[PDB]
Every structure is written in structure tokens, then in C-alpha cells.
Amino acid sequence: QVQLVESGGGLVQAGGSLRLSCAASGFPVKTEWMEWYRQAPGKEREWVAAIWSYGSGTRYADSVKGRFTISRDNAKNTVYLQMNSLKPEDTAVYYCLVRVGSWYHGQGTQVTVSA
Amino acid sequence: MAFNDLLKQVGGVGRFQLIQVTMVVAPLLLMASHNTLQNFTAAIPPHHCRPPANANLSKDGGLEAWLPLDKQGQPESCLRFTSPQWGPPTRVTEPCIDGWVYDNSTFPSTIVTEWNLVCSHRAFRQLAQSLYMVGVLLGAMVFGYLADRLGRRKVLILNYLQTAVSGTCAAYAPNYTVYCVFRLLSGMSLASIAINCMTLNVEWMPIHTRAYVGTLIGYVYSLGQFLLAGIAYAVPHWRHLQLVVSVPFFIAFIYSWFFIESARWYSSSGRLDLTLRALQRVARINGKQEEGAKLSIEVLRTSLQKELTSAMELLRCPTLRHLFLCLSMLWFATSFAYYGLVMDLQGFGVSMYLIQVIFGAVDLPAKFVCFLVINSMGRRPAQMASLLLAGICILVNGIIPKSHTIIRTSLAVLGKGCLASSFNCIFLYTGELYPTVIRQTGLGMGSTMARVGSIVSPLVSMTAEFYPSMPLFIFGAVPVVASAVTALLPETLGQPLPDTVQDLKSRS
Numbered sequence A: 001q002v003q004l005v006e007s008g009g010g011l012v013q014a015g016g017s018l019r020l021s022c023a024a025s026g027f028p029v030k031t032e033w034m035e036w037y038r039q040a041p042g043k044e045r046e047w048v049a050a051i052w053s054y055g056s057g058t059r060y061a062d063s064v065k066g067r068f069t070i071s072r073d074n075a076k077n078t079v080y081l082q083m084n085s086l087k088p089e090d091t092a093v094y095y096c097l098v099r100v101g102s103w104y105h106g107q108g109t110q111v112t113v114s115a
Numbered sequence B: 001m002a003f004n005d006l007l008k009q010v011g012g013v014g015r016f017q018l019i020q021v022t023m024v025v026a027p028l029l030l031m032a033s034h035n036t037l038q039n040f041t042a043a044i045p046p047h048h049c050r051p052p053a054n055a056n057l058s059k060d061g062g063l064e065a066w067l068p069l070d071k072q073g074q075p076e077s078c079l080r081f082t083s084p085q086w087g088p089p090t091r092v093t094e095p096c097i098d099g100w101v102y103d104n105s106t107f108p109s110t111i112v113t114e115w116n117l118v119c120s121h122r123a124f125r126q127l128a129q130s131l132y133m134v135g136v137l138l139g140a141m142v143f144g145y146l147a148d149r150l151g152r153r154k155v156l157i158l159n160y161l162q163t164a165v166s167g168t169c170a171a172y173a174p175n176y177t178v179y180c181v182f183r184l185l186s187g188m189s190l191a192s193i194a195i196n197c198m199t200l201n202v203e204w205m206p207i208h209t210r211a212y213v214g215t216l217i218g219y220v221y222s223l224g225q226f227l228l229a230g231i232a233y234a235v236p237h238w239r240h241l242q243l244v245v246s247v248p249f250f251i252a253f254i255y256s257w258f259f260i261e262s263a264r265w266y267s268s269s270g271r272l273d274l275t276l277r278a279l280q281r282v283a284r285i286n287g288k289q290e291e292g293a294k295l296s297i298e299v300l301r302t303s304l305q306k307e308l309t310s311a312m313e314l315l316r317c318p319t320l321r322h323l324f325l326c327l328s329m330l331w332f333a334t335s336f337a338y339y340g341l342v343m344d345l346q347g348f349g350v351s352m353y354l355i356q357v358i359f360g361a362v363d364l365p366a367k368f369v370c371f372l373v374i375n376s377m378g379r380r381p382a383q384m385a386s387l388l389l390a391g392i393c394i395l396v397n398g399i400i401p402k403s404h405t406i407i408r409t410s411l412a413v414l415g416k417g418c419l420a421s422s423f424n425c426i427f428l429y430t431g432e433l434y435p436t437v438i439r440q441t442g443l444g445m446g447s448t449m450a451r452v453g454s455i456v457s458p459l460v461s462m463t464a465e466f467y468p469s470m471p472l473f474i475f476g477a478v479p480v481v482a483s484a485v486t487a488l489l490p491e492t493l494g495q496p497l498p499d500t501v502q503d504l505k506s507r508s
């Protein structure tokens, strides 16, 4: 099958940087659509950023444009996601999919912004 | 002495010779309308999965927790999440089995909105056009042969009635297959009326009016496609617009009941009593009777006897088979590319009405340019030119990203204009190239293969899911090859106009 274990959950004060990565298998990091979505407590799971196949392009969110960075790594078949100047409302449970619509969904990683 | 002599005795410019032709060509406007119609009827508005009704649409997050975005930040076409949030305190994706939600921003309700022809089994939209064009070809064959067996007035009446009823019932069609069969019948009638218009008008007109007939039919075609532009700008609903473009055949049938049958067909049919009656009637309508009084049964009997006195031999002769194959392949490629170009305007960005009217505008200058080049430089070099510019237009439109709009639209406009010019050029060349023995059958074969290409055009365009623009790639690849083959064929700037199969090798 395909595994999508993600790690990087922790509590960091606002303005810090946290690197989040998902351990993928069964496919390359540049052969399929790759996106990471966030689900805040009481909010809806909204798309944040994505990485296409073969580095076709990079997209972000309207509230996240110029706020976070989405990167991939084909060596370990993982995508490293890091953000700078975390907003107080950025605290959410992050997750990763397998495509723009795919049968594989990540387990989920929760991060805390606090103050 | 021939029929042209007695016609010029009657005239050729009189009141009848204008009212009959203009009335008979009047429905060609709506013919062009119906041929293009699927473009304004089968538009696909932006759409997405309908969220399940069990879950709340307000407190649960809104219209974003169920519909993944696309590459451009738009909702997915035919896919949705099973759950809004997938938290542990199975399959996640799911097709829109709870229906789809469209938008009424520009197009209120089209066929794809009425029957949900998206994603899986989305090819039915192109299937409808392909089957309509299959009906066109079947009509142009079988109805043409039936008309040759029986006549022209009655066949025109049947075509009018069939077109009107088929259009109305297709407008009020409950199920998809019913609509497709109604389109089949509509094409069956429409191709027959289209060809029989030209054949009747060329039969009733003198020898020095064929160019007049051609330019008139081209002008009416362009004005009718402009008329569709206007009508689409008027009424957006598909049912109302379908009825608006279907009724004028129904009303025109009433005054169509007063057509005059082809006197030449009657003479070729072997009977001359009704022929003499027809000439007396047209003389009465033309207002002259003293000269037509001398017209007696023996008068035209002594006048029309020289002319009175198929495919197997077409394919048997090697040179004739070769040039027929080249000509028919040219017809196929030209018609196929033209309808592939004109049937698609979704990825043009601009409004449908504006692109349609500019398409209407470009045709007349293209006709002028083609006439000038054929009367000054020649017909063949203009032919391969027009195909080269059309092909390059199509490929560069395909490769250029969708973001560019003005350049894409102008380039498609130029491609369509030069393709219509190539259409006039190929018709003229085929008419002036074939020997007189098989000239009519050669025109028929060219038309049939052009209809075959037009038939396969929607089939090719259906494969847009494999790659978003490779239908455009094929549309632009076909007539480059067509120009390549047309680069080799005998040239007709010596005005030979062959009449016997033995003459073609003499010229070349």
C-alpha cells in the first residue's frame, strides 16, 4: 500500500519556524500531485499549499501567500513544509494528501501557535 | 439549341428568377445556425460536486470542506471528499453521486446542465454532434438519391417539414437518446435541403449565373452565422433559442408551398406536358406571354435531345483513381479541420457572442482575398497557402498557453477566415478540374468525404481528457498533410476544362 506518516507536531511561539514532513512511499515526490491541508479546531479543512508532479509549479493560499514555504524532497520521497512568522490563527492539525483528490490521506499532525 | 435558349427567351433576370432564388436560399441562414447550434447549446459552465444534503452547509464550514481545488484554484470537476474533516476522533474521495451544482452567471441552462454530462460519460456532448453530422451525411446521400428519383419540390417540402418538427421536438426532448435521435433526423433533413438548394438554383438559372449562385450562397451563409450570433445574444435559454431557430423553417414552409419545379428535371424525367405547363406558368409569372405562346410540345422536343442522348469506373482508372483520392482526401481534411476549429470556443476566454460575430466579420474579406488571388496568381498556390496558414494558426493556438487571449482569438479568426477561403478554392478547383462526364458525381463524392471528415471531427475532439489540447494538435496536423498532398496534382491555369477521360493525361 501507501504510507503517509507525517511528523513535526509541537508547540512553538509565534514568529518561529517549524519544518513539517510526510513520509510517503510507493510513488515519487515529482510524479504525482502533493498538497498539505490544515484543519483548525472548529474550522473547515482548507487547502494551504501544493506541489505538482515534476516541479510543474507551486501554489499557496490567499491567507498563506508569502507566509509559508512548501518544499519537496525526492531522495527520501518526502515533502518538507516550513513556515515563518506563524500567525496566532495558524494553529491547526496539518495533513497531507496523495494527489488533488486521492484515496490516500495522511494520519494528521497537530501544531500549536500559542502566543 | 438547348434549354438555355428557351430560358433566355423567357429571360433569366426577371421577377420570378429573383423571388424564387431569394426565397429558396432564405432558410440557409438558419441552416448555418443549426449547424453551429451545438456550440451555443452545449456550453459547459463551471461545475462541482453537490455537497451531500445530510451535512449542514453553514455551520460545518461552508462550500470549501467538500470540494478540492484545481490547479487554478477552482473547485474540482467531478470529485468530492466523503467527509469534511478526516479526524480519528475506507475511501476519502468520492464522485458526485448526489448530483452536481452549476452556475447561472452567464448560461442559465444548457444541455450539459440539464443532463449532467460531465467527467464520466462526458463524451455524450460530442456524441450528440457526431450523430447529428452522421444524420447530415445519411440525408445528403439517401435523400439526394430519392430526390433524383422523384423530384425537387416535394423533396424540399419534406425537408422543410422534417427540419421544423425535428427541431421543435428536439427542443422539447425528455431524454438524452431522444434528443440525439431528433438531431439525427434534423441533420438528415438539413443536409438534403442544403444540397438541393444549390442544385435547384443552378438548374433554374442560365449558364452565366453559377458564380452569382456561389457568391450568393456564401453571403447568405455568413449572414446567417451572424444571425446566430445575434440570436444567442438575444435569448440564452437552450429550449427557447432552439425553438427560435426551429420555427422559421416551419413558417417558411407555408410560402415554400409555392415553389416552381425544375423544368430541366421534368425534361430529363421524359415527360414534357408538365414541362410545358411549367414554362407557361413561369411566363405568366414573368409577365410575358406573346413569346411564350409559341412554346409547343414539339418546340422543346426539337430543342432538348442532344443532352438526353459511376464509381466503379471512377476507381478503375489508375490516374483517375489517384486524382479522385487526392481530391477527396483534401475535402475530408478541409471540412474536418474547419468543423474542429469552429466547434470549440470554450478555451477562448472572450465572450461567445463577440467571438462569434468577429468570426462572421472575417469571412467576407477572406472571400475577397481568395477571389483576388485565384483571379490574379492562381488557384492551386493559393490553396496550399491557405492550408499552410490555417495549419500554423491551429498549432500555434494549441501550444500557446490559455492565459493569452487577444492573440489566440485573433489567430483563430485568421485561421477560420483562411479556411473558408480554402473552402471556396477547393470547391472551385473541383468544379473546374473534373471531366464533364463525372463532374457532378465527383462533386458528390467530395461532399460525402467532407461530411465523413466533419463526422469524425467531434469524435477526435472527444479525446480531450488524454491531453487538454491534442485535439487541437490533430486539427492542425491534418491540413498540413493535406497541403503536402495537394502540392502534387495537375494545374488548371490553361483552362482546359476536360470532357473525356482521355484528356487528363494530355494536359499532364
Ligand SMILES: CCCN(CCC)S(=O)(=O)c1ccc(C(=O)O)cc1
Pocket (backbone or CB within 6 Å): B035, B194, B195, B196, B198, B214, B217, B218, B221, B335, B423, B424, B427, B454
Ligand atoms: C461554395 C458553396 C459550397 N456550399 C455547398 C452547397 C451544397 S455551402 O452552401 O456554402 C455549404 C453547405 C453545407 C456545409 C456543411 O454542412 O459543412 C458547408 C458548406
